[PDB]
Amino acid sequence: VSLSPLILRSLAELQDGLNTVVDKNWRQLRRPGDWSLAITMEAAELLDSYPWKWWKNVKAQPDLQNVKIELTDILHFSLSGAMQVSDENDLADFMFFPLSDTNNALASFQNIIRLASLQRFQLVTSAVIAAADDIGFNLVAYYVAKHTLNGIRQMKGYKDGTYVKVQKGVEDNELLHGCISPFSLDDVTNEGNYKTKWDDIMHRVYDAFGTPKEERLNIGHWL
Amino acid sequence: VSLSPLILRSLAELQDGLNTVVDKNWRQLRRPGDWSLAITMEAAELLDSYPWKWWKNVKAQPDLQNVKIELTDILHFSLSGAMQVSDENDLADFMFFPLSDTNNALASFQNIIRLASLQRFQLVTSAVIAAADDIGFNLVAYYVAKHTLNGIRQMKGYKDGTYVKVQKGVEDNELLHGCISPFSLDDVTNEGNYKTKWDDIMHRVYDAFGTPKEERLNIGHWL
Ligand SMILES: O=c1ccn([C@H]2C[C@H](O)[C@@H](COP(=O)(O)NP(=O)(O)O)O2)c(=O)[nH]1
Ligand SMILES: O=c1ccn([C@H]2C[C@H](O)[C@@H](COP(=O)(O)NP(=O)(O)O)O2)c(=O)[nH]1
Ligand SMILES: [Ca+2]
Ligand SMILES: [Ca+2]
Numbered sequence: 479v480s481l482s483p484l485i486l487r488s489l490a491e492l493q494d495g496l497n498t499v500v501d502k503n504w505r506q507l508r509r510p511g512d513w514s515l516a517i518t519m520e521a522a523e524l525l526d527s528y529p530w531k532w533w534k535n536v537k538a539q540p541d542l543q544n545v546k547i548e549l550t551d552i553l554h555f556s557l558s559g560a561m562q563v564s565d566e567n568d569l570a571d572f573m574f575f576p577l578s579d580t581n582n583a584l585a586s587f588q589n590i591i592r593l594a595s596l597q598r599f600q601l602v603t604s605a606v607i608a609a610a611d612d613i614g615f616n617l618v619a620y621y622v623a624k625h626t627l628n629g630i631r632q633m634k635g636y637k638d639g640t641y642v643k644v645q646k647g648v649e650d651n652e653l654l655h656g657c658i659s660p661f662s663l664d665d666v667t668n669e670g671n672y673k674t675k676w677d678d679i680m681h682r683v684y685d686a687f688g689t690p691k692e693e694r695l696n697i698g699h700w701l
Numbered sequence: 702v703s704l705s706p707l708i709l710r711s712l713a714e715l716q717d718g719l720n721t722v723v724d725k726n727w728r729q730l731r732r733p734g735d736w737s738l739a740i741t742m743e744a745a746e747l748l749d750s751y752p753w754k755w756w757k758n759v760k761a762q763p764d765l766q767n768v769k770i771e772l773t774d775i776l777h778f779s780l781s782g783a784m785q786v787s788d789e790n791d792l793a794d795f796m797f798f799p800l801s802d803t804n805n806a807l808a809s810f811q812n813i814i815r816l817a818s819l820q821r822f823q824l825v826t827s828a829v830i831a832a833a834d835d836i837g838f839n840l841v842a843y844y845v846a847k848h849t850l851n852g853i854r855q856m857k858g859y860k861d862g863t864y865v866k867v868q869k870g871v872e873d874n875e876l877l878h879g880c881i882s883p884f885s886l887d888d889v890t891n892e893g894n895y896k897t898k899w900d901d902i903m904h905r906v907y908d909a910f911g912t913p914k915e916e917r918l919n920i921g922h923w924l
Protein backbone atom coordinates (compact mmCIF):
# COMPACT_ATOMS: atom_id res chain seq x y z
CA VAL A 479 0.00 0.00 0.00
CA SER A 480 1.36 3.40 -0.99
CA LEU A 481 0.22 6.85 -2.02
CA SER A 482 0.64 8.29 -5.44
CA PRO A 483 4.14 9.80 -5.73
CA LEU A 484 2.59 13.13 -6.62
CA ILE A 485 0.49 13.05 -3.38
CA LEU A 486 3.49 12.07 -1.28
CA ARG A 487 5.53 14.85 -2.82
CA SER A 488 2.83 17.37 -1.94
CA LEU A 489 2.65 16.07 1.65
CA ALA A 490 6.42 16.48 1.85
CA GLU A 491 6.18 20.03 0.63
CA LEU A 492 3.58 20.84 3.24
CA GLN A 493 5.82 19.25 5.85
CA ASP A 494 8.83 21.33 4.74
CA GLY A 495 6.70 24.45 4.90
CA LEU A 496 5.51 23.69 8.41
CA ASN A 497 9.06 22.86 9.55
CA THR A 498 10.07 26.27 8.16
CA VAL A 499 7.37 28.03 10.17
CA VAL A 500 8.93 26.44 13.30
CA ASP A 501 12.45 27.49 12.18
CA LYS A 502 13.49 29.18 8.88
CA ASN A 503 16.73 27.20 8.88
CA TRP A 504 15.38 23.93 10.18
CA ARG A 505 17.35 21.98 7.64
CA GLN A 506 20.62 23.14 9.22
CA LEU A 507 19.42 23.06 12.86
CA ARG A 508 17.78 19.63 12.95
CA ARG A 509 19.45 16.26 12.81
CA PRO A 510 18.11 12.73 12.05
CA GLY A 511 18.20 11.85 15.80
CA ASP A 512 15.72 14.62 16.51
CA TRP A 513 13.11 12.97 14.27
CA SER A 514 13.87 9.56 15.79
CA LEU A 515 13.16 10.98 19.26
CA ALA A 516 10.03 12.77 18.12
CA ILE A 517 8.59 9.60 16.55
CA THR A 518 9.49 7.59 19.67
CA MET A 519 7.55 10.03 21.81
CA GLU A 520 4.50 10.03 19.54
CA ALA A 521 4.61 6.25 19.46
CA ALA A 522 4.46 6.30 23.32
CA GLU A 523 1.38 8.56 22.98
CA LEU A 524 -0.08 6.04 20.50
CA LEU A 525 0.60 3.12 22.87
CA ASP A 526 -0.98 5.04 25.73
CA SER A 527 -4.23 5.13 23.72
CA TYR A 528 -4.66 1.45 24.73
CA PRO A 529 -5.49 -0.05 28.14
CA TRP A 530 -2.08 -1.79 28.33
CA LYS A 531 -1.46 -1.24 32.08
CA TRP A 532 -2.31 -4.28 34.18
CA TRP A 533 -2.06 -2.32 37.43
CA LYS A 534 -4.02 0.85 36.73
CA ASN A 535 -7.58 1.26 35.56
CA VAL A 536 -7.68 -2.26 34.15
CA LYS A 537 -11.16 -2.01 32.62
CA ALA A 538 -10.28 1.14 30.63
CA GLN A 539 -11.25 1.29 26.98
CA PRO A 540 -8.93 2.13 24.02
CA ASP A 541 -9.17 5.63 22.56
CA LEU A 542 -9.40 4.59 18.93
CA GLN A 543 -10.10 8.11 17.64
CA ASN A 544 -6.91 9.28 19.31
CA VAL A 545 -4.97 6.51 17.56
CA LYS A 546 -5.74 8.29 14.26
CA ILE A 547 -4.23 11.56 15.55
CA GLU A 548 -1.07 9.90 16.93
CA LEU A 549 -0.44 8.05 13.61
CA THR A 550 -0.85 11.36 11.78
CA ASP A 551 1.72 12.94 14.16
CA ILE A 552 4.15 10.12 13.42
CA LEU A 553 3.73 10.82 9.67
CA HIS A 554 4.70 14.47 10.15
CA PHE A 555 7.92 13.35 11.82
CA SER A 556 8.67 10.48 9.42
CA LEU A 557 8.21 12.82 6.42
CA SER A 558 10.60 15.21 8.13
CA GLY A 559 13.23 12.56 8.86
CA ALA A 560 13.12 11.32 5.26
CA MET A 561 13.91 14.85 4.03
CA GLN A 562 17.17 14.82 5.90
CA VAL A 563 18.40 11.26 5.48
CA SER A 564 17.56 8.45 3.22
CA ASP A 565 16.87 4.99 4.48
CA GLU A 566 19.99 3.88 2.51
CA ASN A 567 22.15 6.15 4.70
CA ASP A 568 10.29 -5.97 5.20
CA LEU A 569 7.04 -4.36 6.49
CA ALA A 570 5.17 -7.61 7.25
CA ASP A 571 8.03 -8.40 9.72
CA PHE A 572 7.19 -5.33 11.90
CA MET A 573 3.44 -4.68 11.45
CA PHE A 574 0.74 -7.08 12.53
CA PHE A 575 -2.76 -6.93 11.09
CA PRO A 576 -5.56 -6.41 11.98
CA LEU A 577 -4.60 -3.50 14.30
CA SER A 578 -8.07 -3.71 15.79
CA ASP A 579 -6.54 -6.48 17.90
CA THR A 580 -4.89 -4.70 20.84
CA ASN A 581 -2.03 -7.20 21.04
CA ASN A 582 -1.22 -6.64 17.36
CA ALA A 583 -1.37 -2.87 17.93
CA LEU A 584 0.94 -2.89 20.93
CA ALA A 585 3.50 -5.07 19.10
CA SER A 586 3.33 -3.02 15.86
CA PHE A 587 3.54 0.35 17.46
CA GLN A 588 6.50 -0.67 19.58
CA ASN A 589 8.22 -1.77 16.32
CA ILE A 590 7.68 1.75 14.95
CA ILE A 591 9.98 2.84 17.81
CA ARG A 592 12.66 0.33 16.63
CA LEU A 593 12.38 1.63 13.06
CA ALA A 594 12.64 5.25 14.22
CA SER A 595 15.79 4.56 16.20
CA LEU A 596 17.26 2.91 13.07
CA GLN A 597 16.41 6.09 11.16
CA ARG A 598 14.33 4.12 8.71
CA PHE A 599 11.99 7.04 8.09
CA GLN A 600 10.60 5.92 4.76
CA LEU A 601 9.70 2.60 6.30
CA VAL A 602 7.92 4.42 9.15
CA THR A 603 5.93 6.41 6.55
CA SER A 604 5.00 3.11 4.82
CA ALA A 605 3.97 1.63 8.19
CA VAL A 606 1.66 4.58 8.91
CA ILE A 607 0.12 4.40 5.45
CA ALA A 608 -0.42 0.65 5.94
CA ALA A 609 -1.92 1.25 9.43
CA ALA A 610 -4.43 3.81 8.11
CA ASP A 611 -5.36 1.44 5.29
CA ASP A 612 -5.89 -1.37 7.82
CA ILE A 613 -7.79 0.68 10.42
CA GLY A 614 -9.73 2.39 7.64
CA PHE A 615 -9.20 6.10 8.19
CA ASN A 616 -8.33 8.95 5.84
CA LEU A 617 -4.64 9.53 6.56
CA VAL A 618 -4.20 12.23 3.96
CA ALA A 619 -7.16 14.25 5.23
CA TYR A 620 -5.97 13.83 8.90
CA TYR A 621 -2.51 15.01 7.83
CA VAL A 622 -3.87 18.19 6.21
CA ALA A 623 -6.06 18.93 9.20
CA LYS A 624 -3.32 18.37 11.83
CA HIS A 625 -0.84 20.24 9.63
CA THR A 626 -3.20 23.23 9.84
CA LEU A 627 -3.55 22.92 13.67
CA ASN A 628 0.20 22.73 13.92
CA GLY A 629 0.45 26.10 12.15
CA ILE A 630 -2.29 27.61 14.33
CA ARG A 631 -0.41 26.48 17.41
CA GLN A 632 2.73 28.25 16.22
CA MET A 633 0.66 31.43 15.61
CA LYS A 634 -0.76 31.22 19.16
CA GLY A 635 2.44 31.01 21.22
CA TYR A 636 3.28 27.32 21.18
CA LYS A 637 7.07 27.92 21.07
CA ASP A 638 6.76 30.43 23.93
CA GLY A 639 4.88 28.13 26.28
CA THR A 640 1.72 30.25 26.32
CA TYR A 641 -0.62 27.87 24.45
CA VAL A 642 -3.29 25.76 26.17
CA LYS A 643 -4.28 22.52 24.32
CA VAL A 644 -7.31 21.52 26.46
CA GLN A 645 -10.03 24.12 26.91
CA LYS A 646 -13.53 23.66 28.41
CA GLY A 647 -13.08 19.91 28.42
CA VAL A 648 -12.04 19.71 24.73
CA GLU A 649 -8.52 18.98 23.39
CA ASP A 650 -7.62 20.92 20.21
CA ASN A 651 -6.90 17.58 18.40
CA GLU A 652 -10.43 16.34 19.04
CA LEU A 653 -11.92 19.18 16.96
CA LEU A 654 -10.11 17.85 13.86
CA HIS A 655 -12.38 14.79 13.41
CA GLY A 656 -15.36 16.96 12.43
CA CYS A 657 -13.25 19.06 10.11
CA ILE A 658 -12.33 15.97 8.01
CA SER A 659 -15.44 13.76 8.08
CA PRO A 660 -17.06 15.34 4.94
CA PHE A 661 -14.00 14.33 2.83
CA SER A 662 -13.58 11.03 1.04
CA LEU A 663 -10.32 9.26 0.23
CA ASP A 664 -10.93 10.05 -3.43
CA ASP A 665 -11.65 13.72 -2.67
CA VAL A 666 -8.18 14.17 -1.16
CA THR A 667 -6.21 12.00 -3.60
CA ASN A 668 -7.90 12.95 -6.95
CA GLU A 669 -5.17 13.89 -9.40
CA GLY A 670 -6.90 16.98 -10.76
CA ASN A 671 -8.81 18.32 -7.78
CA TYR A 672 -7.00 17.24 -4.60
CA LYS A 673 -5.53 20.66 -3.93
CA THR A 674 -8.91 22.34 -3.71
CA LYS A 675 -10.06 19.67 -1.22
CA TRP A 676 -6.92 20.14 0.90
CA ASP A 677 -7.60 23.89 0.83
CA ASP A 678 -11.12 23.17 2.00
CA ILE A 679 -9.84 21.07 4.96
CA MET A 680 -7.55 23.91 5.90
CA HIS A 681 -10.38 26.50 5.85
CA ARG A 682 -12.46 24.17 8.08
CA VAL A 683 -9.69 23.90 10.67
CA TYR A 684 -9.12 27.66 10.65
CA ASP A 685 -12.88 28.08 11.23
CA ALA A 686 -12.78 25.57 14.14
CA PHE A 687 -10.19 27.76 15.89
CA GLY A 688 -11.67 31.10 14.80
CA THR A 689 -8.50 32.14 12.99
CA PRO A 690 -8.89 35.68 11.64
CA LYS A 691 -9.12 35.64 7.82
CA GLU A 692 -5.90 37.74 7.48
CA GLU A 693 -3.83 35.20 9.44
CA ARG A 694 -5.04 32.24 7.36
CA LEU A 695 -2.74 30.55 4.93
CA ASN A 696 -4.26 28.86 1.90
CA ILE A 697 -3.02 25.74 0.03
CA GLY A 698 -0.90 27.82 -2.34
CA HIS A 699 1.24 29.06 0.56
CA TRP A 700 2.53 25.53 1.07
CA LEU A 701 3.01 24.06 -2.46
CA VAL B 702 29.14 0.12 39.71
CA SER B 703 26.84 -2.39 41.39
CA LEU B 704 24.97 -2.99 44.61
CA SER B 705 25.84 -5.64 47.10
CA PRO B 706 24.21 -8.93 46.03
CA LEU B 707 22.42 -9.09 49.35
CA ILE B 708 20.91 -5.58 48.75
CA LEU B 709 19.88 -6.48 45.21
CA ARG B 710 18.27 -9.66 46.44
CA SER B 711 16.26 -7.71 49.00
CA LEU B 712 15.15 -5.19 46.35
CA ALA B 713 14.04 -8.13 44.21
CA GLU B 714 12.05 -9.55 47.06
CA LEU B 715 10.31 -6.25 47.63
CA GLN B 716 9.58 -6.09 43.91
CA ASP B 717 8.09 -9.61 43.91
CA GLY B 718 5.94 -8.67 46.87
CA LEU B 719 4.64 -5.55 45.18
CA ASN B 720 3.96 -7.45 41.94
CA THR B 721 1.97 -9.91 44.06
CA VAL B 722 -0.13 -7.12 45.56
CA VAL B 723 -1.05 -6.14 41.95
CA ASP B 724 -1.82 -9.80 41.07
CA LYS B 725 -1.35 -12.93 43.26
CA ASN B 726 -0.38 -14.94 40.18
CA TRP B 727 1.63 -12.30 38.41
CA ARG B 728 4.32 -14.77 37.54
CA GLN B 729 1.88 -16.72 35.35
CA LEU B 730 -0.03 -13.69 33.98
CA ARG B 731 2.89 -11.47 32.96
CA ARG B 732 5.30 -11.97 30.12
CA PRO B 733 8.74 -10.44 29.34
CA GLY B 734 7.17 -8.15 26.67
CA ASP B 735 5.02 -6.53 29.34
CA TRP B 736 8.12 -5.35 31.22
CA SER B 737 9.73 -4.18 27.97
CA LEU B 738 6.66 -2.02 27.26
CA ALA B 739 6.52 -0.70 30.79
CA ILE B 740 10.19 0.35 30.74
CA THR B 741 9.72 1.95 27.30
CA MET B 742 6.88 4.04 28.66
CA GLU B 743 8.78 5.14 31.76
CA ALA B 744 11.76 5.99 29.59
CA ALA B 745 9.44 8.30 27.54
CA GLU B 746 8.43 9.91 30.86
CA LEU B 747 12.14 10.29 31.69
CA LEU B 748 12.87 11.87 28.29
CA ASP B 749 9.94 14.23 28.73
CA SER B 750 11.66 15.60 31.87
CA TYR B 751 14.00 17.47 29.46
CA PRO B 752 13.27 20.45 27.19
CA TRP B 753 13.90 18.35 24.04
CA LYS B 754 11.11 19.85 21.88
CA TRP B 755 12.37 22.51 19.48
CA TRP B 756 8.85 23.66 18.62
CA LYS B 757 7.15 23.97 22.00
CA ASN B 758 8.17 25.96 25.03
CA VAL B 759 11.77 26.15 23.87
CA LYS B 760 13.12 27.93 26.97
CA ALA B 761 11.70 25.29 29.35
CA GLN B 762 13.95 23.92 32.06
CA PRO B 763 14.65 20.21 32.81
CA ASP B 764 12.85 18.66 35.76
CA LEU B 765 15.89 17.03 37.35
CA GLN B 766 14.04 15.93 40.50
CA ASN B 767 11.55 14.09 38.31
CA VAL B 768 14.41 12.31 36.55
CA LYS B 769 15.15 10.56 39.88
CA ILE B 770 11.55 9.27 40.11
CA GLU B 771 11.45 8.02 36.50
CA LEU B 772 14.78 6.12 36.93
CA THR B 773 13.37 4.53 40.09
CA ASP B 774 10.25 3.48 38.11
CA ILE B 775 12.46 1.90 35.46
CA LEU B 776 14.23 -0.10 38.22
CA HIS B 777 10.93 -1.53 39.44
CA PHE B 778 10.22 -2.79 35.93
CA SER B 779 13.77 -4.00 35.19
CA LEU B 780 13.83 -5.96 38.49
CA SER B 781 10.51 -7.46 37.45
CA GLY B 782 11.67 -8.41 33.95
CA ALA B 783 14.82 -10.06 35.34
CA MET B 784 12.66 -12.30 37.56
CA GLN B 785 10.98 -13.76 34.53
CA VAL B 786 13.79 -14.03 32.01
CA SER B 787 17.49 -13.94 32.18
CA ASP B 788 19.55 -11.78 29.91
CA GLU B 789 21.03 -15.05 28.51
CA ASN B 790 17.56 -16.07 27.28
CA ASP B 791 28.83 -3.39 27.21
CA LEU B 792 27.38 -0.54 29.36
CA ALA B 793 29.80 2.19 28.20
CA ASP B 794 28.42 1.58 24.65
CA PHE B 795 24.87 2.68 25.68
CA MET B 796 25.30 5.18 28.56
CA PHE B 797 27.00 8.52 28.20
CA PHE B 798 28.37 10.39 31.20
CA PRO B 799 27.94 12.94 32.67
CA LEU B 800 24.11 12.76 32.45
CA SER B 801 24.00 16.37 33.58
CA ASP B 802 24.61 17.10 29.90
CA THR B 803 21.17 17.03 28.28
CA ASN B 804 22.49 15.57 25.02
CA ASN B 805 24.11 12.68 26.92
CA ALA B 806 20.86 12.15 28.84
CA LEU B 807 18.67 12.06 25.75
CA ALA B 808 21.00 9.59 24.00
CA SER B 809 21.38 7.35 27.09
CA PHE B 810 17.75 7.21 27.99
CA GLN B 811 16.75 6.38 24.44
CA ASN B 812 19.26 3.47 24.61
CA ILE B 813 17.43 2.20 27.71
CA ILE B 814 14.45 1.75 25.34
CA ARG B 815 16.63 -0.36 22.97
CA LEU B 816 17.81 -2.52 25.88
CA ALA B 817 14.25 -3.00 27.13
CA SER B 818 13.04 -4.15 23.74
CA LEU B 819 15.94 -6.64 23.67
CA GLN B 820 14.76 -7.90 27.07
CA ARG B 821 18.14 -7.17 28.57
CA PHE B 822 16.65 -6.45 31.99
CA GLN B 823 19.77 -6.97 34.05
CA LEU B 824 21.60 -4.53 31.84
CA VAL B 825 18.79 -2.00 32.34
CA THR B 826 19.15 -2.45 36.13
CA SER B 827 22.93 -1.84 35.78
CA ALA B 828 22.25 1.26 33.66
CA VAL B 829 19.93 2.71 36.33
CA ILE B 830 22.42 1.98 39.09
CA ALA B 831 25.14 3.66 37.00
CA ALA B 832 22.85 6.66 36.28
CA ALA B 833 22.09 7.20 39.99
CA ASP B 834 25.80 6.93 40.78
CA ASP B 835 26.57 9.51 38.08
CA ILE B 836 23.75 11.95 38.93
CA GLY B 837 24.43 11.44 42.63
CA PHE B 838 21.12 10.37 44.11
CA ASN B 839 20.15 7.61 46.54
CA LEU B 840 18.61 4.99 44.25
CA VAL B 841 17.99 2.46 46.98
CA ALA B 842 16.18 4.97 49.19
CA TYR B 843 14.09 6.24 46.18
CA TYR B 844 13.19 2.63 45.38
CA VAL B 845 11.93 1.94 48.91
CA ALA B 846 9.95 5.16 48.97
CA LYS B 847 8.32 4.66 45.54
CA HIS B 848 7.73 1.00 46.34
CA THR B 849 5.70 2.18 49.35
CA LEU B 850 3.71 4.72 47.23
CA ASN B 851 3.04 1.98 44.73
CA GLY B 852 1.43 -0.10 47.50
CA ILE B 853 -0.57 2.88 48.78
CA ARG B 854 -1.87 3.47 45.27
CA GLN B 855 -3.10 -0.11 45.07
CA MET B 856 -4.85 0.32 48.47
CA LYS B 857 -6.56 3.51 47.21
CA GLY B 858 -8.21 2.24 44.01
CA TYR B 859 -5.45 2.52 41.42
CA LYS B 860 -6.53 -0.65 39.56
CA ASP B 861 -10.15 0.57 39.57
CA GLY B 862 -9.44 3.98 38.07
CA THR B 863 -10.54 5.91 41.15
CA TYR B 864 -7.14 7.29 42.25
CA VAL B 865 -6.06 10.90 41.68
CA LYS B 866 -2.25 11.45 41.47
CA VAL B 867 -2.20 15.29 41.52
CA GLN B 868 -4.02 17.00 44.39
CA LYS B 869 -3.94 20.70 45.38
CA GLY B 870 -1.10 21.33 42.96
CA VAL B 871 1.09 18.47 44.29
CA GLU B 872 1.83 15.14 42.52
CA ASP B 873 2.07 12.13 44.87
CA ASN B 874 5.62 11.41 43.55
CA GLU B 875 6.84 14.84 44.60
CA LEU B 876 6.14 14.08 48.28
CA LEU B 877 8.72 11.25 48.17
CA HIS B 878 11.78 13.56 48.05
CA GLY B 879 11.21 14.76 51.62
CA CYS B 880 10.59 11.25 52.85
CA ILE B 881 14.09 10.13 51.72
CA SER B 882 16.33 13.18 52.28
CA PRO B 883 17.27 12.24 55.92
CA PHE B 884 18.78 8.91 54.70
CA SER B 885 22.35 8.42 53.57
CA LEU B 886 23.63 5.88 51.05
CA ASP B 887 25.32 4.06 53.92
CA ASP B 888 22.14 4.11 56.03
CA VAL B 889 20.26 2.14 53.35
CA THR B 890 23.06 -0.22 52.30
CA ASN B 891 24.64 -1.05 55.73
CA GLU B 892 24.88 -4.82 56.01
CA GLY B 893 23.61 -5.05 59.57
CA ASN B 894 21.11 -2.22 59.81
CA TYR B 895 19.72 -1.54 56.32
CA LYS B 896 16.39 -3.19 57.01
CA THR B 897 15.55 -0.86 59.87
CA LYS B 898 16.34 2.15 57.64
CA TRP B 899 14.15 0.78 54.84
CA ASP B 900 11.38 0.30 57.43
CA ASP B 901 11.87 3.90 58.47
CA ILE B 902 11.51 5.13 54.84
CA MET B 903 8.31 3.14 54.56
CA HIS B 904 6.83 4.64 57.76
CA ARG B 905 7.68 8.15 56.43
CA VAL B 906 5.84 7.53 53.17
CA TYR B 907 2.82 6.09 54.97
CA ASP B 908 2.82 9.25 57.14
CA ALA B 909 3.01 11.48 54.02
CA PHE B 910 -0.21 9.89 52.73
CA GLY B 911 -1.90 9.56 56.13
CA THR B 912 -2.18 5.78 55.84
CA PRO B 913 -4.06 4.40 58.85
CA LYS B 914 -1.70 2.41 61.10
CA GLU B 915 -3.71 -0.83 60.56
CA GLU B 916 -3.27 -0.67 56.78
CA ARG B 917 0.49 -0.14 56.98
CA LEU B 918 2.86 -2.88 56.00
CA ASN B 919 6.27 -2.99 57.64
CA ILE B 920 9.60 -4.21 56.17
CA GLY B 921 9.02 -7.76 57.42
CA HIS B 922 5.94 -8.09 55.21
CA TRP B 923 8.15 -7.89 52.14
CA LEU B 924 11.32 -9.89 52.99
O1 LIG C 1 9.59 20.69 13.40
C1 LIG C 1 8.36 20.22 13.71
C2 LIG C 1 7.96 20.09 15.02
C3 LIG C 1 6.70 19.59 15.27
N1 LIG C 1 5.88 19.20 14.29
C4 LIG C 1 4.48 18.70 14.55
C5 LIG C 1 4.19 17.28 14.12
C6 LIG C 1 3.16 16.76 15.10
O2 LIG C 1 1.89 16.69 14.41
C7 LIG C 1 3.11 17.85 16.18
C8 LIG C 1 3.27 17.26 17.58
O3 LIG C 1 3.20 18.31 18.54
P1 LIG C 1 3.15 18.03 20.11
O4 LIG C 1 3.63 19.32 20.70
O5 LIG C 1 3.89 16.79 20.44
N2 LIG C 1 1.55 17.95 20.58
P2 LIG C 1 0.46 16.76 20.13
O6 LIG C 1 1.18 15.40 20.14
O7 LIG C 1 -0.62 16.83 21.14
O8 LIG C 1 -0.04 17.16 18.78
O9 LIG C 1 4.20 18.73 15.94
C9 LIG C 1 6.29 19.36 13.03
O10 LIG C 1 5.50 19.01 12.04
N3 LIG C 1 7.51 19.83 12.74
O1 LIG D 1 3.25 -5.10 38.22
C1 LIG D 1 3.66 -3.85 38.52
C2 LIG D 1 3.04 -2.76 37.95
C3 LIG D 1 3.51 -1.50 38.28
N1 LIG D 1 4.54 -1.32 39.11
C4 LIG D 1 5.03 0.05 39.52
C5 LIG D 1 6.45 0.40 39.11
C6 LIG D 1 6.45 1.90 38.89
O2 LIG D 1 7.14 2.51 40.00
C7 LIG D 1 4.96 2.28 38.93
C8 LIG D 1 4.55 3.10 37.72
O3 LIG D 1 3.17 3.42 37.82
P1 LIG D 1 2.45 4.43 36.82
O4 LIG D 1 1.00 4.06 36.92
O5 LIG D 1 3.08 4.36 35.47
N2 LIG D 1 2.52 5.97 37.46
P2 LIG D 1 3.91 6.87 37.69
O6 LIG D 1 4.83 6.67 36.48
O7 LIG D 1 3.44 8.27 37.81
O8 LIG D 1 4.50 6.38 38.97
O9 LIG D 1 4.22 1.05 38.92
C9 LIG D 1 5.11 -2.39 39.66
O10 LIG D 1 6.12 -2.25 40.49
N3 LIG D 1 4.69 -3.64 39.35
CA1 LIG E 1 3.29 14.81 21.18
CA1 LIG F 1 0.46 13.30 19.52
Ligand SMILES: [Ca+2]
Nearest residue numbers: 742743746774
Ligand atom coordinates in the same frame (compact mmCIF):
# COMPACT_ATOMS: atom_id res chain seq x y z
CA1 LIG G 1 4.29 5.77 34.29
Ligand SMILES: [Ca+2]
Nearest residue numbers: 743746771774
Ligand atom coordinates in the same frame (compact mmCIF):
# COMPACT_ATOMS: atom_id res chain seq x y z
CA1 LIG H 1 6.97 7.42 36.06
